[PDB]
């Protein structure tokens, strides 16, 4: 029953 | 055929940031940055599902850092202001002295910053009013809804006043019983 | 406030076809409303949309961990989240409230417009037809189109441009997923 977050990634550099 | 969108944003110099989930143009939930709580669009959603607000706050921190990188990389190229189009409607056909809701639909605008004020006979309405967060669009502009429940009468006129940096003067959209 | 603004818009999209049979994931990034870089599940790696996104596409594609997480999203993120909210999103069916009332094009003449108000329904998929004495009236129809109220309800007003003559029976027929056969509301002059 938990909504999953698409984890944000850092840009370069 | 359905679409689920996890829409986020970070805006400078305002330091404004939002995180939300969209299902076919409708908001499932959003996370308030002032607090650390998952705000469900409808009460029932929170009873059938759950979300860890911490994930949203962590993503907003990454978006902020990414915006800094992007601002520098673009050699400080600013956003072009796209002014909104405003529509005032009622959630159902209006019946005299039978409660209804006034909807102020703010659409097709960027950046996601707007000052929205309901006016009853030219006077601001501070209580009873509710609003949505900045909702996504296919063209990557923003949508927003402002709500005002009311008792329809022939003596009370309403106006939704919207202010945006893309507008020369505030936009006023009218509603009266006919 | 005349100060310049800078906006970063990540959009993580999950597109569904035949339930969860075919699922497509897109991780898109917009800088000042302009798409710079994107991951599309049909491609399998990051691609630059503008020259601004080229460093990110190359950097994210060089990391096997980032690529594997994005390639797994259709199952671990898309299909998962679809199942979490299915009962109150995909399964959501809210009946329309159908009302028929006469109105006027301009306040200088008698009732020359018949309004069919179709409100508070979910989902947005709807068909509204006007009938006069069992025959479909195609010409003279003006609608507001589909209106999203923002509270998981939709509304529409389908108006017929007609001068009602006594004895005429007009029917507004509504078709929506919430009801098995069509809905009908009659109006007599
Ligand atoms: C500054 O960044 C822009 C990208 O928006 C690029 O076109 C331009 O060449 C850069 N200027 C310099 C001096 O490198
Ligand atoms: C809203 O009002 C405040 C105070 O008057 C002002 O500083 C701000 O710039 C306004 N925002 C917009 C979008 O007009």
Helix axes C54-62, C64-73, angle to 10 degrees: 90
Same domain, C51 and C108: no
- CA A10 to chain B, closest CA, distance in angstroms equals 6
Provide the CATH number for the domain around residue C97.
2.60.40.10
Task: Single out the residue of C87, C85, C141, C151 nearest to residue C121, CA to CA.
Answer: C151
The length of chain C is 189
Q: Distance between CA atoms of C61 and C55, rounded to whole angstroms?
A: 10
State the distance between the two ends of chain C, measured CA to CA, in whole angstroms.
57
Q: Residue B106 is part of which domain span?
A: 79-178
Give dist(CA C41, CA B54) in Å, integer.
27
Q: Are C34 and C107 part of one and the same domain?
A: no
Cβ–Cβ of B28/A3 closer than 8 Å?
yes
CB contact under 8 A, B66 and C84: no
CA B148 → CA B19, B118, B129, B171, distances in Å?
25, 8, 5, 18
- In the beta sheet, which residues pair with residue C121? C154
Between CA B140 and CA B110 the distance in angstroms is 9
B10: which chain C residues are within 8 Å (Cβ-Cβ)? Answer: 7-8
Q: What is the DSSP track for B35-101?
A: TTEEEESSTTHHHH-B--HHHHHHHHHHHHHHHHHHHHHTTSPPPPPB--EEEEEESS---TTS-EE
Atom 13 of ligand 1: nearest residue by CA position = B75
Are B39 and B106 part of one and the same domain? Answer: no
DSSP 8-class letter at C40 = E
Q: CB–CB of A6 and C27 under 8 A?
A: yes
Place of tokens 């202001």: B81
The beta strand positions in chain C, using DSSP E, are 6-17, 22-31, 34-40, 46-48, 97-103, 113-121, 127-132, 135-136, 141-143, 147-148, 154-161, 169-175, 183-188
Please provide residue C126's backbone torsions phi and psi, each rounded to the nearest 5 degrees. Answer: -150, 150
> What's the CATH number where C29 sits?
3.10.320.10
Distance (Å, rounded) from C-alpha B161 to C-alpha B1? 37
Nearest residue to B112 via CA among B128, B129, B136: B136
Structural domain count of chain C: 2
Contacts of residue A11 in chain C, CB cutoff 8 Å? 55-56, 59
Q: Contact C105/C112 with Cβ under 8 angstroms?
A: yes
| C-beta B126 within 6 A of ligand 1 | no
CB C72 within 8 A of CB C150: no
Whether ligand 1 lies within 6 angstroms of the CB of B15 is answered as no
Check B91 against C6: CB less than 8 A apart.
no
Q: Point out the domain boundary residue: C45, C73, C90.
A: C90
Q: What's the distance, CA B146 to chain centroid?
A: 7
Last residue of some domain: C55, C90, C125?
Answer: C90
Closest CA to C11 of C28, C33, C23, C35: C28
Taking contacts as CB-CB distances below 8 angstroms, the residues of chain B near A3 are 21, 28-29, 49-51
Yes or no, beta carbons of C56 and A8 under 8 Å apart: no
| C123–B contact, CB cutoff 8 A | yes
Closest CA to B130 of B113, B116, B111: B116
Please report the resolution in angstroms: 2.4
| Location of structure tokens 């969209």 | B22
| Residue B48, φ and ψ in degrees, nearest 5 | -105, -20
Contact B134, B26 (CB under 8 A): no
Residues C148 and C81 in one domain: no
For residues C30 and C119, state if they share a domain: no
Residue C51 Cβ inside 6 Å of ligand 2? The answer reads no
| Domain co-membership, B127 together with B55 | no
Neighbours of B86 (CB within 10 A): 24
The structural domain count of chain B equals 2
Q: Which of B32, B49, B78 is the last residue of a domain?
A: B78
Give the residue, out of B71, B75, B77, with the most ligand 1 atoms within 8 A of its beta carbon, to mutate for a pocket test: B75
Q: Best of B86, B163, B164, B167 to mutate for ligand 2, by most ligand atoms within 8 A of CB?
A: B163
CATH number at residue B68: 3.10.320.10
Q: Are residues B99 and B152 in the same domain?
A: yes
Q: Kindly state whether residues C189 and C99 are assigned to the same domain.
A: yes
- The reply to whether B27 and B96 lie within a common domain is no
Q: Are residues C80 and C95 in the same domain?
A: no
The residue out of C63, C90, C117 marking a domain boundary is C90
Q: For residue B119, list its beta bridge partners.
A: B124, B159
Residue minimizing CA distance to atom 4 of ligand 1: B74
Q: C60 and C128: one domain?
A: no
Helices (H), chain C: 54-62, 64-73, 80-85
Experimental technique: X-ray
Ligand number nearest CA of B114 is: 2
Q: B57 and B17, same structural domain?
A: yes
| Residues C81 and C98 occupy one common structural domain | no
Q: How far apart are CA C26 and CA C15, in angstroms?
A: 8
* B28 touches B7 (CB < 8 A): no
Nearest to C3 by CA among B70, B79, B143: B79
C77·A9 Cβ contact <8 A = no
Query: What's the DSSP call for residue C148?
Result: E
**Set of chain C residues whose Cβ sits within 8 Å of the Cβ of A4:** 76-77, 80-81, 84
Cβ-contact C128, C143 below 8 angstroms: yes
What b/e string do you get for C164-181 counting C-beta neighbours within 10 Å, with b at 16 or more? beeeeebbbbbebeeeee
Contacts of B118 (CB under 8 A, 6+ apart): B102, B104, B124, B125, B129, B146, B148, B158, B159, B160, B161
H/E element holding B31?
strand B26-32
Q: Is A5 exposed, middle or buried (0-12, 13-18, 19+ CB in 10 A)?
A: buried
Same domain? C86 vs C114: no
CB B169 within 8 A of CB B86: no
> For residue C116, which of C98, C103, C134, C142 has the smallest C-alpha distance?
C98
Residue C93 to residue C131: CA distance in whole angstroms: 26
Which domain does C67 fall in, by range? 1-90
Query: B44-83: string of b/e by CB count within 10 Å (b at 16+)?
Result: ebeeebebebebbeebbebbbebbebbbebbeeeebeebe
Per the CB < 8 A criterion, the answer to whether B1 and C19 are in contact is no
Q: Are residues B87 and B174 located together in one domain of the fold?
A: yes
């Amino acid at each position: 029953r938990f909504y999953k977050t698409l984890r944000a990634e850092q840009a370069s550099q | 055929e359905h679409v689920i969108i996890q829409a986020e944003f970070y805006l400078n110099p305002d330091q404004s940031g939002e995180f939300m989930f969209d299902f076919d143009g409708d908001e499932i939930f959003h996370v308030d940055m002032a607090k650390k709580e998952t705000v469900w669009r409808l009460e029932e959603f929170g009873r059938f599902a759950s979300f860890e607000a911490q994930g949203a706050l962590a993503n907003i921190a990454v978006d902020k850092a990414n915006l800094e990188i992007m601002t520098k990389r673009s050699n400080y190229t600013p956003i072009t202001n796209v002014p909104p189009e405003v529509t005032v409607l009622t959630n159902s056909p209006v019946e005299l002295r039978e409660p209804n809701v006034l909807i102020c639909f703010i659409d097709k605008f960027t950046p996601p910053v707007v000052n929205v004020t309901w006016l009853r006979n030219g006077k601001p309405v501070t209580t009873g009013v509710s609003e949505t967060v900045f909702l996504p669009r296919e063209d990557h502009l923003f949508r927003k809804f402002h709500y005002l429940p009311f008792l329809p009468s022939t003596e009370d006129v309403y106006d939704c006043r919207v202010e945006h940096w893309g507008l020369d003067e505030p936009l006023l959209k009218h509603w009266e019983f006919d | 406030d005349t100060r310049p603004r800078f906006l970063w818009q990540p959009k993580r999209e999950c597109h569904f076809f035949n339930g969860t049979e075919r699922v497509r994931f897109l991780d898109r990034y917009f800088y000042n409303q302009e798409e710079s870089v994107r991951f599309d599940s049909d491609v399998g790696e990051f691609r630059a949309v503008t020259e601004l996104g080229r460093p990110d596409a190359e950097y994210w594609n060089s990391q096997k961990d980032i690529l594997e997480q994005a390639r797994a999203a259709v199952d671990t993120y898309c299909r998962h989240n679809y199942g979490v909210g299915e009962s109150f999103t995909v399964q959501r069916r809210v009946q329309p409230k159908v009302t028929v009332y006469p109105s006027k094009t301009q306040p200088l003449q008698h009732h020359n417009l018949l309004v069919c108000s179709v409100s508070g329904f979910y989902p947005g998929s709807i068909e509204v037809r006007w009938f006069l004495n069992g025959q479909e009236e195609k010409a003279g129809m003006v609608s507001t189109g589909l209106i999203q109220n923002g509270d998981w309800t939709f509304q529409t007003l389908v108006m017929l441009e007609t001068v009602p003559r006594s004895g005429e029976v007009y029917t507004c027929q509504v078709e929506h997923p919430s009801v098995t056969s069509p809905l009908t509301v009659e109006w007599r002059a």
